[PDB]
Amino acid sequence: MTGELEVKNMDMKPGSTLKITGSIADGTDGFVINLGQGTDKLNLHFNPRFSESTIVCNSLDGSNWGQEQREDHLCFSPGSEVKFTVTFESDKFKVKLPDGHELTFPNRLGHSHLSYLSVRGGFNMSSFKLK
Amino acid sequence: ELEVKNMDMKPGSTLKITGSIADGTDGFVINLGQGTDKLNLHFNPRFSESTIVCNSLDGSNWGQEQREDHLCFSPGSEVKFTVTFESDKFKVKLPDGHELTFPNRLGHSHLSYLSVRGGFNMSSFKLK
Numbered sequence A: 001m002t003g004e005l006e007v008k009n010m011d012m013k014p015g016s017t018l019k020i021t022g023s024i025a026d027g028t029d030g031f032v033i034n035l036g037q038g039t040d041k042l043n044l045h046f047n048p049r050f051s052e053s054t055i056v057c058n059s060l061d062g063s064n065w066g067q068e069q070r071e072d073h074l075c076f077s078p079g080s081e082v083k084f085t086v087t088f089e090s091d092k093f094k095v096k097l098p099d100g101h102e103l104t105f106p107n108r109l110g111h112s113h114l115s116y117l118s119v120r121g122g123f124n125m126s127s128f129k130l131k
Numbered sequence B: 001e002l003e004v005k006n007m008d009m010k011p012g013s014t015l016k017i018t019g020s021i022a023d024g025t026d027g028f029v030i031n032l033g034q035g036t037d038k039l040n041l042h043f044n045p046r047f048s049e050s051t052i053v054c055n056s057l058d059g060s061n062w063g064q065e066q067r068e069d070h071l072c073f074s075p076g077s078e079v080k081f082t083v084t085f086e087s088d089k090f091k092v093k094l095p096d097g098h099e100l101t102f103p104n105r106l107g108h109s110h111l112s113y114l115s116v117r118g119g120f121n122m123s124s125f126k127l128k
Ligand SMILES: OC[C@H]1O[C@@H](O[C@H]2[C@H](O)[C@@H](O)[C@@H](O)O[C@@H]2CO)[C@H](O)[C@@H](O)[C@H]1O
Pocket: A045, A047, A056, A057, A058, A065, A068
C-alpha cells in the first residue's frame, strides 16, 4: 500500500486537465490510475495491463463495475517513465498517452467535480498537476 | 482541503508544492507527516501576524512552535514551496528565496501524509 498514492478533496471541474508523471516498476504486469468523486464512484478507472497487452478503462458505481472499454494500443512498458494527461469534460475523458496517442472514454457518472485520485500496482507517481 | 496519503518520502527527498493563496485569507497550512495526528511538519504562514509558524504534532500534543518573520508573499499569488526532508530537519525554500528550517522531532520513518488547509489551492505536487 506504500506508494499507492491517494489524493482526496481535489476540485477537478469539467474542462480541466490533470497531468501525471511516474515510473513504472520493472517486471510489473500492470497498474491503475483511478479518478472520480470518491472511492466507490470512479468516473475513470485507467488500467494498463502489460500482462494482457491492453489498456482497460471502466467506471465503478458502488460495488458494480461498468462495461469495460479495452484499447489494444499499449505501447509503453514495465520500467518506462511515463507521462499522461487526463482531460475531464462533462461528456467524456481524454487520456493522452506517452506517445501522443489519445484515448477517449465516456463519462458515465455525471459532471460533479472530481475529488479523488488513486494509484494501485506498479506505478510510482512522482508528480501531478491540475490545470 | 487536499490530502495525499501513502506517499513514500524518505530522508534526502524533496517535495515541491505549487498553489494559489486565496484572496483575503488570513493564512494557510501545509502539513507533512504520517497522519492527521502525527505531523512532523506543520507549516503555517499567517498574514495577520506577518510570520510563518511551524510546529510538530504528536497525537494530541503540539510541540514548541517556531516562528519565522520572513513572510514575503501574498494572497492572490501562485506560489511555490520546496520542502527537503532530512533526518534531523526540514528545509523549506520560500518563493522569495529565503530558506527556513524546522527540526524533525518524530524520527525518520518515511513521510506518507500531506495535507493542505486554509486559504491554499494546491495545483501541483512533485516528489523527488
Ligand atoms: O473492469 C475493470 C476491473 O476488472 C477486474 O478484472 C476483471 C476482468 O478485467 C474482466 O475480464 C472480468 O471478467 O473479471 C475481472 C474481475 O471483475 C479487475 O480486478 C479490476 O481491478 C478492474 O480493473
